[PDB]
Design a protein around this ligand. Structure first.
Ligand SMILES: Nc1ncnc2c1ncn2[C@@H]1O[C@H](COP(=O)(O)OP(=O)(O)O[C@@H]2O[C@H]([C@@H](O)CO)[C@@H](O)[C@H](O)[C@@H]2O)[C@@H](O)[C@H]1O
Length: 445
């Protein structure tokens, strides 16, 4: 599960597809047998997911908690774990399906690993494999999630018009793409809603804060328009909306707030853009209570907003301590997203943990001045930042594992020196306090 290894394997798959383009179809019984074998040795859950993806059951691979309201223990997991555990074998089955010229199945595996590989910043090579599949057998259906993935890397690269042709093609034509078949009409609205969200991100990249916020609101409406509302998308859009609220000026936020078409409770309940942002982050963390990373990012932004507002001249002195305590709670939740000592992978998650440490130390400095524990916690924070940037710059996998473990050890030490106490929740699988009520009805007035 390394970027370089996976990237090289995807390159090999692409080379195989090119060679098959030069060769005439002659699938040997060995090829078919190794295809069936490689798929059969995968765990049952992944075989089911592969068959469902191949059958075009959904345009996105869903999470068990994403569409269910009456959630339970079997729903409170994330596919990152099962996919990450069988990634090597999923790629072996991908190569095997390519050699068997079963491009529909190979595309199904591409669909399955798409999200995890985006986390590894290797979506380009994966999309090269998809293009080779389409070159061999043009009728091979490609999931809208993968097309949108192309849009995503194009936005991340600054190719805004290129991404916008993809997004606009999906939006203006009811999500139609290639030879993909929707089983119901609502999945089209879902694809449209993700594309509209990405339009919001494009306008955010351009600093058109008001219109970006409007598009994000539209994506929220679309997520609510589904038979089962998309809680994951709502969490994402609430976070993006929070960042936009932070970047907005006060006149931007006032113009957005005075638009009656936008029936957001937080828009009419708060008058300061940082407080609206903090509330939007609270809701975003509530809506992804079983995915600790997004809870951590959301509460990080929340704590930053409350820290910034508490020091503002717009904050009444009676509430300064209350908002500082709210920021303290937020950063505490963020640090509590990691329990006991499980490894932490990814520069983003690590960076978010150090961000939570800096936030909590800053809040303590605001509450108790320059105490000794603020100095010790500050030293631990700077150490964690040093090992963090060493991690980000290192190319040796073992150094990255070691620096990650050390950085998390430091994080645990700031947790001890600052007395972060676990919160009470009747849902031991949830990463948010009960105060963070997951209520979709309160989003709307
Ligand atoms: N709840 C969340 N909070 C904060 N950040 C989040 C988040 N969920 C995802 N992210 C970040 O957004 C980036 C793209 O996400 P993805 O899961 O890689 O996209 P995709 O595989 O197409 O899955 C679809 O995502 C839609 C939105 O949530 C994101 O566009 C959902 O509405 C669809 O139902 C579907 O799940 C990435 O950087 C991730 O870390």
């Amino acid at each position: 599960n390394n970027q370089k290894v996976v990237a090289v394997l995807l390159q090999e798959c692409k080379q195989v597809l090119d060679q098959l383009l030069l060769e005439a179809p002659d699938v040997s019984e060995e090829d078919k047998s190794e295809d069936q074998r490689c798929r059969a040795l995968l765990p049952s859950e992944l075989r089911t997911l592969i068959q469902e993806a191949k059958e075009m059951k959904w345009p996105f691979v869903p999470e068990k908690w994403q569409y269910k309201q009456a959630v339970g223990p079997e729903d409170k997991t994330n596919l990152k774990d099962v996919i990450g555990a069988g990634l090597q074998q999923l790629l072996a089955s991908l190569r095997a399906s390519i050699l068997a010229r079963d491009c529909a199945a190979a595309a199904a595996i591409v669909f399955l690993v798409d999200r995890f590989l985006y986390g590894l910043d290797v979506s380009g090579k994966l999309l090269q494999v998809a293009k080779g599949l389409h070159k061999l057998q043009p009728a091979t259906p490609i999931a809208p999630q993968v097309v949108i993935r192309q849009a995503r890397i194009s936005v991340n690269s600054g190719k805004l018009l290129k991404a916008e042709y993809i997004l606009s093609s999906l939006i203006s034509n009811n999500g139609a793409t290639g030879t993909w078949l929707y089983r119901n009409e609502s999945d089209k609205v879902l694809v449209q809603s993700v594309c509209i969200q990405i339009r919001g991100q494009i306008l955010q990249k351009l600093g058109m804060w008001y219109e970006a916020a409007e598009l994000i609101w539209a994506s929220i409406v679309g997520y609510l328009a589904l038979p089962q509302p998309d809680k994951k998308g709502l969490s994402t859009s609430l976070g993006i909306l929070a960042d936009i609220f932070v970047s907005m000026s006060k006149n931007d936020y006032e113009k957005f707030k005075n638009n009656p078409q936008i029936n957001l409770s937080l828009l009419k309940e708060f008058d300061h853009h940082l407080l609206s942002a903090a509330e939007a982050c609270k809701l975003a963390a509530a809506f992804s209570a079983y995915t600790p990373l997004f809870v951590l990012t959301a509460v990080n932004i929340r704590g930053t907003c409350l820290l910034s507002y508490s020091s503002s001249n717009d904050c009444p002195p009676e509430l300064k301590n209350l908002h500082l305590c709210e920021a303290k709670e937020a950063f505490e939740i963020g640090l509590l997203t990691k329990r006991d000592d499980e490894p932490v992978t990814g520069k983003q998650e690590l960076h978010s943990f150090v961000k939570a440490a800096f936030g909590l130390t800053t809040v303590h400095r605001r509450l108790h001045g320059e105490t000794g524990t603020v100095h010790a916690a500050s030293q631990l924070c700077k150490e964690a930042m040093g090992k963090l940037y060493n991690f980000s710059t290192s190319s040796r996998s073992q150094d990255r594992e070691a620096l990650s473990q050390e950085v998390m050890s430091v994080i645990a030490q700031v947790k001890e020196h600052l007395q972060v106490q676990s919160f009470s929740n009747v849902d031991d699988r949830s990463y948010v306090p009960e105060s963070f009520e997951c209520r979709l009805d309160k989003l709307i007035l």
